[PDB]
Amino acid sequence: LPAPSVTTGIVDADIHPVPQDGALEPYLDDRWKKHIREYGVRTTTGLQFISEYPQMYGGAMRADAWPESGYPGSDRELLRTQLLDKHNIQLGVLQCLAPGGQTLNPAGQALNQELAAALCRATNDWQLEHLVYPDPRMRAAIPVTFETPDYAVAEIERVGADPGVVAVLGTSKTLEPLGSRKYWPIYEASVAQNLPIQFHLSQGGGHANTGTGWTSYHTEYHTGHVQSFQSQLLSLVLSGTFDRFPTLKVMFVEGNVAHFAPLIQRMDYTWETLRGELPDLQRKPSEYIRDHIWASTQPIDEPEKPEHLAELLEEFCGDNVVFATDYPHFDFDDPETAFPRSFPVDLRDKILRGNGMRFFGV
Amino acid sequence: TLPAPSVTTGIVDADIHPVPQDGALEPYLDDRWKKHIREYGVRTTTGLQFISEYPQMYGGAMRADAWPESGYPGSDRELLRTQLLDKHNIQLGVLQCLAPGGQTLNPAGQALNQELAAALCRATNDWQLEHLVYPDPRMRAAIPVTFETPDYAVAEIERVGADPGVVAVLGTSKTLEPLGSRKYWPIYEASVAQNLPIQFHLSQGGGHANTGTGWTSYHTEYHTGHVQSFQSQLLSLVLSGTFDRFPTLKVMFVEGNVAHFAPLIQRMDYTWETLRGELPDLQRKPSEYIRDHIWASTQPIDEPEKPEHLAELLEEFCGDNVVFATDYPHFDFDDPETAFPRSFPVDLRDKILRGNGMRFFGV
Amino acid sequence: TLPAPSVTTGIVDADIHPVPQDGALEPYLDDRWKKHIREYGVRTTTGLQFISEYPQMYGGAMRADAWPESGYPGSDRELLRTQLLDKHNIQLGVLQCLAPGGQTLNPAGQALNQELAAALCRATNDWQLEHLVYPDPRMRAAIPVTFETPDYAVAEIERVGADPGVVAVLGTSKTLEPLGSRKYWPIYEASVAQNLPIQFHLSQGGGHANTGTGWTSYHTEYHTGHVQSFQSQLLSLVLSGTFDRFPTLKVMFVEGNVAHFAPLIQRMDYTWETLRGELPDLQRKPSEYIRDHIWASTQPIDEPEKPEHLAELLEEFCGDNVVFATDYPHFDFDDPETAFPRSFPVDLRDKILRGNGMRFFGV
Amino acid sequence: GTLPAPSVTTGIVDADIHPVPQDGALEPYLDDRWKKHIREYGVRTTTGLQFISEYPQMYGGAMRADAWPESGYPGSDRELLRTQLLDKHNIQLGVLQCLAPGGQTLNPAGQALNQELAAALCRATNDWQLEHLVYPDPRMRAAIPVTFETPDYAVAEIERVGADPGVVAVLGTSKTLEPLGSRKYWPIYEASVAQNLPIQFHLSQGGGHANTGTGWTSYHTEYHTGHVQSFQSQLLSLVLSGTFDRFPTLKVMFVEGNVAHFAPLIQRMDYTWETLRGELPDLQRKPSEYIRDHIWASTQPIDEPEKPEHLAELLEEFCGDNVVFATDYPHFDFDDPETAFPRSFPVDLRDKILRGNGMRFFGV
Ligand SMILES: [Fe+3]
Ligand SMILES: [Fe+3]
Ligand SMILES: [Fe+3]
Ligand SMILES: [Fe+3]
Ligand SMILES: [Fe+3]
Ligand SMILES: [Fe+3]
Ligand SMILES: [Fe+3]
Ligand SMILES: [Fe+3]
Ligand SMILES: [Mg+2]
Ligand SMILES: [Mg+2]
Ligand SMILES: [Mg+2]
Ligand SMILES: [Mg+2]
Ligand SMILES: [Mg+2]
Ligand SMILES: [Mg+2]
Ligand SMILES: [Mg+2]
């Protein structure tokens, strides 16, 4: 399969396909089909069929993205024409967030981690056969079980070298902050395959959705997603994970972008005083961003004064911001209208093209 | 070379708590970590500089008669020798060091800086061997290791686990993942490789609340609540199939009480009869794992209203797998002369005091 | 430090048979074993001084055109380079040394003196690395070890298994116990620890007759009969749950043919659907182990009467787990230019020549 | 458990007694999965036969016709074993060798091809014989069957119960898949020596090979006389492999392999070694020099030469200190201590066969 080529089209770092009903069954062992029929996929809830914050308005999907039968993102033809052709996407990165007709219930978060591994492997076989190889404008970010590194390492070794794969896919929420040594074998395996890692917004993880209680209303739930990414960035940087893995690239997907700038600013300021706690950390904290931390754009930040967007994106790192649409979610961003009227044209071009080309090794 | 432990006329005491005198760990700690501790203390799963989330009540939870001239109970090796080892003819006394200093329960392995945790575990292990075990090998060490960082724990088990002064690996009852999780399997593998069993002692911390349904308020809730963590760990270790992967691993629950395990296991089997289809990989019936894999120490002894129920429940658990402990110098210390009810059978009392622990510890 | 293998424009050849020149192993053998060989030869499971129980037919079963100026086919590294590596652009060629001298098939690991066998395996490994691999690292070694004495095999895997010139551990298709037996588990453990897969090459010997129902008479029976041992080994490795214990272990059956594995596995599943209750601990359906654990090399390529059936059966086995081999310099050598039928799909052949072997060897 | 060491006073040693569990007596000691497995499959071994071994017994199961209790198989009634054997012959150390999990003569637990089942049956047998027989009447002591063909499981069982004072030996079979000097078995020898336990190898069928080195026998004379051959082969391997150089305190007894034939076997071994010893240059002693410290043999079924004086000659040519009395109760060729030896047999040799020799083997 040839390497991805981006020339006059664009990069889209976050696309959500969904398998049609039964589409994963050719790839699952018999024991897991039986298990799912009898138990469903238990996770960090007391609920049979939904997550703890079920989608609010029409499944949080584009009203115009429902096909003849099935869920938005389950129709390959509609995805080719409504997304890939429409916006001339030449590298579109698939992030499968659910094994079935659902918006968000990640395979890696099944509490039966052997089932989780089986669902991740089936998703990877499915997306490569059903989407990537038939139309290699798409490439896969492969879900793995971050909470069981041995299984994730196995899956990265199995398919990580496939030219259809461009990243390893995790979740924004975890049981330990991602700088923990628990996850280091996954980083090691990813670097060995020259794969970057994308962490997509998730529920679950094992803790409440904030550091100070479970949220009540939808504003709190959705705005609160940024908090997990703030916590993860701090851990990955301050733990020295990037001293251990100096080539490891990480992208935060659907965590927003602008907030990272003042977070990193406060991180440096605090470190100037308190650095003595972490004497093995080799660089000033913000010095890790350019080489290690990326963010995708959707849902685009919308300051009251539009000029503040480019300022904050550059205060984060202008080279490390990568366009995404989030097709087919309701807060989908269109490359023709996402950026504010006065946004600098050269920054926009690299967000659409060069920045993601660098992140994915194009 | 230190001789193997020998139990002839004396008894096994599976849980004794020494503490290092002030400064006693400093020879075994690098200056970077000594400075760290001076500035930051041993930060753990609390917002408190020096104490844990449930500080002890009356007198530090220590026996009122166990205080040396100066220092904390358990810090004077001569007083431990005369008030405990000599007094009760303890010939295998297993040390479980629960704090790096003059405190009751602040385990080194639970420091959130896991590099500091590993350094403190290492220092504790060198200290207890040099200061207590080698001078008086009636004592032997259960070595604290960092269960939450398996690589560091494995390194420590490799470093010191084969020393004849060590008889077990020491963990905590509370953990971030239940102990049957694959996370901990490298520790089980290393322990088996060194022919060591594992003891899990009552702890605070772990990362979750002290119950599965909120943090407790009063001391009755806190102290009675320690049993709950061990119920949860037993279920995880058994149902996960950990003992199918490690068919020679022996684990003891220390200071989780004993009798409650019997009806827990009984409910486990009864539920499994219906729901076993969820866990088709598990090789044996759940209760069948107990005899070869799960031990419990006795302190604080269960005290039923009708004392005859004690022996019944210990046998319903597994009479061969119950091991005596005193918990010296804690306030609820059990004296082997007075702990057993009058009708208790001699066969069970004798193996609790000697043979059962000899089997667990490989003596 | 030897670079990792790199397969770009060329191919993987999973089975190449070099032979030491006369005396070439002597620098790597202790004088005691030199003396033993002079006085006893290499006694194995025969009553024969020099040959195995089924000696080769025409020309030693070697290619008529593979004889160097002096010595046995495979004994001249320059002819190996020009007639094999250069001729077919082999970029990962895996050496399987089947004899310590100028013979076709007399494996070191099968010497009945297992101390001698271990010394010959060690000497073969030092020799092939120094004479062949390091001078031309398109070649890499599958290291013979003594499967019938696991302690010695483990020692040799520890000694040389991490060398970058080594890509696999080498065993024999015939053994005294089926390969899923716990006897061989220490070897699987050591191989996994060195991130090494295992290749089992066609062999005579083992301790049993060459079929499960008597010794064969004619060469058709002997040579077609080699498939049988691999069928038996696959069944044991799968049904024993060896891959439940070692979930990262990869094994390749070398020169057992490929297509027959598909109906064998199909029968295994169909029988297990009824009889699975005998082995309730096996975690997966039997055929489900193939994809993650069982590979097969292609030579001598299966030749169905209707060529279309080849691709069908290779895919019914597992198309990602089939790896090219030439078997140079044996008479039934497969040329990668001609081995596959005209209509065979390019993607499947490409995987067989490149990606599949790269995955198996971790390249 | 706690139990005095055996005391042999005015009584005798009996090195081979065959008890058998009554129907169901092992079930309290077996996991549910193995009870189910046995119900559904029986105990598969190296045969194509559901219920019998490849050479089933000829006449009445090869039991003496007077040892049948009210209900069970011979050897299944503890009271009958006490009065018919231990009381009757003043046996003060009677060593139990349980050869079957049930009333089915000669079917060793260790030879089940499912070695996890085999281990479970060995463990159940050990728990049962200690509880039902040894502890109630400690004149009896156990030779604990273990799975020789799966050393990890055997080592575990030796570690589990091998230090129990009710146990006096580890119990194996005369036939194995590899000769007993093979390194495969060395972990078992290591674990046995660590528990200061000797090993007894009892006559068996099975093993994985034919019952001779040159084909399967046809008639019962060939089968029963053929049992000595396996012991000949095992002695040669154990000695010539240097197993006793590696384990210099290891003691082994061949049980029910006869005695006299060992003498000329060893004699031929030395004579051959004098020429060919260069093949095995590490061996520390002349082959026959291993016997005194390492190899014992029990007497039953006693050798019956045509001229009785040859018996004592051959027993001394083997090693007079290393011959140990056994009855083989309740099998048909049972030997009685009062009549087994020829009238002219030396009294000093007989006394040590009945007492001193076995005391030294079992560490009494
Ligand atoms: Fe998204
Ligand atoms: Fe979204
Ligand atoms: Fe305590
Ligand atoms: Fe306490
Ligand atoms: Fe070959
Ligand atoms: Fe060949
Ligand atoms: Fe007998
Ligand atoms: Fe007999
Ligand atoms: Mg600045
Ligand atoms: Mg300053
Ligand atoms: Mg540094
Ligand atoms: Mg390697
Ligand atoms: Mg198993
Ligand atoms: Mg099962
Ligand atoms: Mg003993």
TrEMBL record, chain D:
Domain Amidohydrolase-related: 104-363
Cysteine sulfenic acid (-SOH) found at: 319
Residues that coordinate or bind Fe(3+) 2: 256, 328, 331
Keyword annotations: Hydrolase, Lyase, Metal-binding
Protein's GO biological process: secondary metabolic process
InterPro entries the UniProt entry points to: ACMSD (IPR032465), Amidohydro-rel (IPR006680), Metal_Hydrolase (IPR032466)
Origin organism lineage: Bacteria, Bacillati, Actinomycetota, Actinomycetes, Mycobacteriales
Keyword field contains Hydrolase: yes
Pfam families: Amidohydro_2 (PF04909)
Residues at which Mn(2+) 2 binds: 256, 328, 331, 333
Name of the protein in its database record: Amidohydrolase
Binding residues annotated for Mn(2+) 1, in chain numbering: 16, 18, 202, 256, 328
Residues bound to Fe(3+) 1: 16, 18, 202, 256, 328
An example Gene Ontology CC term for this record: cytoplasm
Residues annotated as binding Mg(2+): 281
GO molecular function per UniProt: carboxy-lyase activity; hydrolase activity; metal ion binding
